[PDB]
């Protein structure tokens, strides 16, 4: 059994990564230029794109790749590090609003997780929570085309 999404840890921080097209992606503001652990020792990033807050490693063992959305919908679903699935309406290239706003702590440690279309394909990686007095009402995300172009 393989997973598309890996729960990840650094000393100071905790976040998610999403495998797509054979690459394991997450947010720069989590991993920096750090390497990924493997049973043969550290593996270096293949991609680092600070402009876009995006880094990629080679897909780890025990992982499955997500297919990118060709599907177009604006109905997205954000998956958290607890495997909650949060409905999000897409507004712009890289913006979407929660259908039911949540305390920001509910999104904590979930950046790098996937926004999925209705077919369960990849629309983008969850980048950042837009908060108002502690309530997350929308999210920034890295569109999946940014990944494709980076490649």
């Amino acid at each position: 059994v393989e997973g598309e999404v890996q729960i990840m840890s650094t000393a100071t921080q905790t976040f998610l990564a999403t495998c797509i097209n054979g690459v394991c992606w997450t947010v720069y503001h989590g991993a920096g230029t750090r390497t990924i652990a493997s049973p043969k020792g550290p593996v270096i990033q293949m991609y680092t794109n600070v402009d876009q807050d995006l880094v990629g490693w080679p897909a780890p063992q025990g992982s499955r790749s997500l297919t990118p959305c060709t599907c177009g919908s604006s109905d997205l679903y954000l998956v958290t590090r607890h495997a909650d699935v949060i409905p999000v309406r897409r507004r712009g290239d890289s913006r979407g609003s929660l259908l039911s706003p949540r305390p920001i702590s509910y999104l904590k440690g979930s950046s790098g997780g996937p926004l999925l279309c209705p077919a369960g394909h990849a629309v983008g990686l969850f980048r950042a929570a837009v908060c108002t007095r502690g309530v997350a009402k929308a999210v920034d995300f890295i569109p999946v085309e940014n990944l494709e172009t980076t490649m």
Binding site: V1, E2, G3, E4, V5, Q6, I7, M8, S9, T10, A11, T26, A31, R34, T35, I36, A37, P42, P60, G62, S63, R64, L66, V79, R81, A83, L116, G120
Partner: peptide, 16 residues
């Protein structure tokens, strides 16, 4: 330091 993997999520819910 290196980034380590501490768990995994399977989207379909597929059991081992």
């Amino acid at each position: 330091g290196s980034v380590v993997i501490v768990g995994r999520i399977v989207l379909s819910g597929k059991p081992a």
